């Protein structure tokens, strides 16, 4: 009946696996609780303290009983416990393409005919030019291609697989730095 006077971060990491698995450790006749009245669709009222503790919401100004114009939603870093991101998967594969407005190429930042990037006024100027000289109503290439299933099967199959394997190895759900921060 003695308290552990010396506490370490690794002890907290070890306890975090138990903390995460306590959600599934609850077993009853219906296993996970909070089902509906006469249907199997589980109700969203799972106000567990562990889950709700690391929950942050924002009142974003979305405009374009009172009117209540402001909209409540999650934004920025979702988790309440912030941790340093792993230095990986920074590079992204991108394909050059033409904007619908004009011959302006667009890979990441939009680039005009010259080497310089397009400016704020130049975009409006191009829009006005294309309004004044509109043509090709329908006979043109289709922008915003209709995505189909199995598209980018390589991406759907192997992208970020090592991260999933690492998560399966860890099963901690909190990287640890957020605890020190708080």
């Amino acid at each position: 009946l003695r308290v552990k006077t010396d506490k370490d971060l690794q002890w907290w990491r070890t306890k975090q696996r138990v903390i995460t698995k306590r959600k599934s450790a609850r077993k009853r006749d219906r296993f996970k609780k909070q089902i509906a009245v006469v249907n199997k669709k589980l109700a969203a009222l799972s106000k567990k303290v562990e889950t709700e503790k690391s929950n942050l919401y924002q009142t974003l100004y979305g405009n374009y009983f009172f009117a209540k114009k402001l909209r409540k939603k999650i934004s920025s870093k979702g988790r309440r416990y912030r941790s340093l991101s792993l230095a990986r998967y920074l590079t992204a594969t991108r394909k050059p393409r033409l904007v619908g407005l004009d011959n302006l190429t667009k890979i990441d930042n939009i680039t005009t005919l010259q080497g310089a990037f397009i400016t704020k006024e130049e975009k409006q100027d191009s829009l006005n030019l294309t309004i004044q000289r509109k043509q090709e109503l329908t006979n043109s290439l289709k922008k915003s291609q209709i995505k189909k299933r199995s598209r980018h099967s390589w991406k759907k199959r192997s992208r970020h697989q090592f991260s999933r394997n690492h998560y399966k190895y860890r099963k901690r759900h909190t990287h640890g730095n957020g605890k020190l921060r708080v």
Partner: protein, 616 residues
């Protein structure tokens, strides 16, 4: 919260005067700086506010300003109202006469003249140090807009002769190197690396030649060319400056480990009283044992599940997945062995108390799918599957009973091998939230079964045209180009024909929410040949400023009197062979949700309905 609000009081600031603030323009203007102060006009203040403002202003604008002094003078002695004056003294040069830029070979002379004319000092004496920073900022902005990040202003000279000259130093790629790394797997939450395609091949694909300028688009293209190889997992490129014109590009690459294994084990012990007995534990259930191997690239996932140990012959399950991403240029080939169960509505329609039947298909399918162009899809599939029928509990049913035959063999379970071709072409485009164009869909199912499936040929052709309304005048979204969704008329024609002997599981039918609104699935008819014609008018509500659109549809389905030709004549059994014509009016809300009231003239019953997904 403003000046007129509190005219009278004590120790209240009346006016804020800013003097000595540099007029370079790169820094915020006088009013912009006033709007960011702690002291506000018409509000109480103390000495702490003045000290905090002085410290903050000194810290945030350290380079330009040498000293900021805040003083207070009484407007009137008795009123106690005061005026707060800010005086700024920046660092200055004893004399600057002309400005010049040296180097910068890539920059044309026009920009050189423009930047020189932009930063002309007004007075040749006591010139502040903001001019050199402005020139540097302009040059850096020009070069960064051009896309070169490493072209920077070196330093400034000519101060002895009073000629502020900015010597721009350019940089070029000098050395390119490669490193091979492998990350390990552990629960330590801190990845460790082990340092170990041809390196020359990587260099050639990147195409980083010495003595060339570095550009962001060049880096993106090199990254794309390097990652074009599917074997590599992660890539990283960094153009670090060499300790000045030399840029050393470092490339780091890591491969992917394809092996993966998932194991499960379940135990059950009859404790009774005291310690349990382990002698009888010959074996234990092993759950599902999953083996995956990604390795060009060939996905291979096997999953074998045993319900219990010491007897795997009962309640066993197998699933196999194979995919080859790079087998063909624009085509991918996959093979899946699996099972699936789904209820049947055409065979056992309600409109009565007909119990539904559940079809179960377990087998293998190998198909090649190609995406030609952007919206054109071609799929060819060969599938061999055991098809069975079970109602309620898992018991095979010989034939449907309220009796039409359930399958072709008559035993409720058979094996069928068949070929299926799917061709989809789409010119439909969504402009301003409204879709216009044409879409063709062709499905062919040929049963090369000569083994109870038999010879069967099912052909389905669907043509949908979203056309601008001829009566409606041209909208502003087409001419002005800028914000209106055009009114649309949708004409849809679906034709389905079946030949040969086809089992009731795959029999063509007519009805269902998608095919004809207002009918339950199988209500209209179940015939080998059918024709569905739908005409809809869709109008956006953007003119009234209301979200969503309003539409009205009329659909007619005709079975061409093929119900009698159908084996067993199911339509006669349930006594609903009548052709249907249903018309309705609906509103499509945000997204694809639709709420429509539809009336069917066959029985004169109107009903509301809500659906998710586009009508056509």
């Amino acid at each position: 919260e403003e000046k007129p609000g509190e005219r009278s009081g004590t120790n209240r600031c009346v006016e804020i005067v800013i003097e000595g603030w540099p007029d370079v323009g790169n820094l915020p203007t006088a009013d912009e700086l006033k709007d960011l102060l702690t002291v506000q006009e018409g509000h109480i203040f103390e000495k702490q506010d003045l000290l905090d403002d002085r410290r903050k202003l000194e810290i945030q604008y350290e380079d330009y300003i040498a000293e900021v002094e805040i003083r207070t003078e009484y407007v009137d002695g008795k009123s106690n109202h005061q005026r707060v004056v800010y005086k700024f003294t920046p660092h200055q040069f004893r004399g600057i006469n002309a400005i010049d830029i040296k180097g910068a070979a890539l920059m044309p002379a026009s920009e050189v003249e423009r930047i020189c004319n932009e930063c002309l000092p007004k007075q040749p004496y006591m010139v502040d140090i903001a001019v050199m920073d402005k020139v540097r900022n302009r040059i850096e902005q020009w070069y960064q807009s051009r896309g070169l990040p490493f072209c920077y202003v070196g330093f400034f000279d000519g101060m002895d002769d009073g000629i502020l000259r900015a010597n721009v130093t350019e940089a070029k790629i000098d050395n390119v190197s490669v490193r091979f790394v492998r990350p390990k797997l552990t629960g330590d939450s801190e990845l460790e690396y082990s340092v170990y395609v041809k390196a020359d091949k990587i260099i050639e694909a990147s195409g980083f030649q010495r003595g060339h300028h570095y550009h962001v688009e060049d880096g993106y293209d090199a990254m794309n060319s390097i990652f074009a190889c599917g074997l590599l997992e992660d890539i990283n490129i960094e153009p670090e400056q060499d300790p000045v014109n030399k840029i050393n590009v470092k490339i780091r690459c890591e491969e992917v480990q394809p092996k993966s294994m998932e194991l499960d084990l379940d135990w059950s012990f009859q404790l009774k009283n005291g310690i349990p007995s382990i002698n009888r534990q010959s074996l234990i259930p092993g759950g599902s044992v999953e083996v995956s191997h990604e390795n060009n690239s060939e996905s291979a996932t096997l999953s074998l599940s045993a319900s219990d140990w010491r007897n795997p012959s009962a309640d066993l399950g197998f699933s196999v997945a194979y995919s080859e991403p790079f087998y063909k240029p624009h085509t991918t080939r996959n093979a899946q062995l699996f099972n699936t169960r789904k209820t049947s509505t055409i065979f056992t329609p309600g409109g009565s108390e007909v119990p539904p039947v559940f079809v179960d298909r377990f087998g293998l399918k190998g198909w090649t799918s190609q995406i030609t162009g952007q919206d054109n899809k071609v799929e060819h599939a060969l599938m061999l599957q055991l098809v069975s029928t079970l109602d309620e509990n898992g018991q095979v049913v010989a034939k449907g009973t309220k009796g039409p035959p359930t399958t072709n063999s008559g035993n409720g379970r058979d094996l069928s091998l068949s070929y299926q071709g799917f061709f989809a072409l789409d010119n439909v485009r969504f402009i301003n939230g409204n879709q216009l164009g044409e879409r063709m869909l062709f499905q062919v199912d040929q049963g090369l079964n000569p083994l109870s499936g038999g010879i069967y040929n099912r052909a389905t052709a669907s043509y949908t045209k979203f056309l601008e309304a001829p009566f409606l005048p041209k909208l502003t979204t087409e001419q002005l180009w800028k914000r209106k969704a055009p009114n649309t008329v949708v004409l849809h024609a679906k034709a389905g024909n079946a030949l040969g002997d086809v089992a009731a599981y795959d029999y063509f039918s007519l009805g269902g929410p998608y095919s004809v609104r207002g009918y339950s699935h199988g209500e209209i008819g179940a015939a080998r040949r059918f024709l569905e014609l739908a005409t809809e008018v869709r109008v956006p509500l953007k003119n009234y400023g209301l979200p969503g659109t309003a539409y009205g549809f009329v659909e007619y389905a005709t079975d061409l009197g093929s119900g009698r030709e159908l084996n067993g004549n199911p339509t006669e059994y349930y006594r609903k062979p009548g052709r249907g014509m249903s018309y309705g009016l609906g509103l499509k809300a945000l997204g694809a949700c639709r709420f429509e009231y539809a009336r069917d003239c066959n029985a004169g019953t109107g009903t509301f309905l809500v659906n998710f997904g586009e009508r056509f």
